[PDB]
Amino acid sequence: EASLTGAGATFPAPVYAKWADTYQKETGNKVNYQGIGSSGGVKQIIANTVDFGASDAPLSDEKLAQEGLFQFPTVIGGVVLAVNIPGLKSGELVLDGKTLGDIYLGKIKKWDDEAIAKLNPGLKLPSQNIAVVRRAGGSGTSFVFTSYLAKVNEEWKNNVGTGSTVKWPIGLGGKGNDGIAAFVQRLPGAIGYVEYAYAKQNNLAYTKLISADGKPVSPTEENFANAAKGADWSKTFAQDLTNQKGEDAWPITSTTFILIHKDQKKPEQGTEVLKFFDWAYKTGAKQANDLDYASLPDSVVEQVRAAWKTNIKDSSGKPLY
Ligand SMILES: [Br-]
């Protein structure tokens, strides 16, 4: 029985924790995962203070090569806009990218702004103030959210840009996906971006969004998967799944990555990390699905397996898989 430690992205923490719990019950192995943020996840793996780092933002090929890291995706999730609007239920409100950006730009301050009124004709919107909530530190969720906004709102693109950390025009800072959930839940009129599972598990209302194709879509596990149907994984694991074309493609979709060293100095640890993730691909789909994360296609996992055999070695060049 091995004792493993990972750290990083809170975006997939619900499924990683679930997989960890089950894995221990079936095999005795213990995986301790700390949701500290994708930025931290990266610093820790590079500082070798954990067996594996987790980040939603991918490292470029050059950056991976420079640090001697290997990156592989695990699941597909989606970022949603949790809202606390009195007298509105979950799924009722529809926003489009431009409008979501203007709210984040602080240009739209009330829940009944003409712009929101127009996207929701049958709606009885309150003249309530918009309480914008965003992430306090370096965040992979912030990375995919800002990547999406830069694509749909020119002013956001030019003035704030994309990043795990950006100069937010407005908004209160929340720590972790859980911190944003908690804030929205306590602030009437709040809007905060969270990975879908955090909204569902906390019974937060969320909005629908309009797809790149121009249609209103609901955030569901299938819709996160739809957004990725067009990705050419054979080309690279570092797929941008935001604002993708296609039917029922959730526009703020993203995979998430696990980072491990190519040259394993504690090969036993490395072997066990690989076995845990291999077990998760082989047997963890239902648990990811129960938590509304979509599984990667089998062809992608096979690619990941082949790359493990090719890239992960002990200091004597011996593969660990
Ligand atoms: Br944070």
Ligand 1 centroid to residue 39 C-alpha, Å: 9
Question: Tokens standing for 221?
Answer: 């596990």
- The answer on whether 99 is annotated among ligand-binding residues is no
Domain spans in the chain, listed from the N-terminal domain onward: 1-77+230-239+254-321, 78-229+240-253
- Residue type present at position 68: G
Q: Resolution of the deposited coordinates, in angstroms?
A: 1.9
Ligand 1 centroid to residue 292 C-alpha, Å: 22
* Cβ pair 262, 312 in contact under 8 A: yes
Q: How many residues does the chain have?
A: 321
- The answer on whether 190 is annotated among ligand-binding residues is no
Fold of 78-229+240-253: D-Maltodextrin-Binding Protein; domain 2 (3.40.190)
> What is the Cα–Cα distance from 255 to 239, expressed in whole angstroms?
8
> What is the Cα–Cα distance from 49 to 248, expressed in whole angstroms?
41
Ligand 1 centroid to residue 264 C-alpha, Å: 30
Enumerate residues with CB within 5 Å of ligand 1 (an ion). Answer: 135-137, 175
Ligand 1 centroid to residue 176 C-alpha, Å: 4
* Cβ pair 173, 136 in contact under 8 A: yes
> What is the Cα–Cα distance from 192 to 94, expressed in whole angstroms?
15
Q: Which residues pair with 95 in a beta bridge?
A: 209
Judged by DSSP in three states, 202 sits in coil
Domains 1-77+230-239+254-321 and 78-229+240-253 share a fold: yes
Q: Which residues pair with 134 in a beta bridge?
A: 173
> What is the Cα–Cα distance from 5 to 243, expressed in whole angstroms?
34
For 106, other C-beta atoms within 10 Å of its C-beta total 13
The CATH architecture to which 1-77+230-239+254-321 belongs is 3-Layer(aba) Sandwich (3.40)
- The answer on whether 205 is annotated among ligand-binding residues is no
**Residue keyed to tokens 């994708």:** 38
Q: b or e along 54-88 (b: 16 or more beta carbons within 10 Å of the residue's beta carbon)?
A: bbbbbbeeeebeeeebbbbbbbbbbbbbbbbbeeb
Ligand 1 centroid to residue 49 C-alpha, Å: 20
- Residue type present at position 54: A
* Cβ pair 196, 265 in contact under 8 A: no
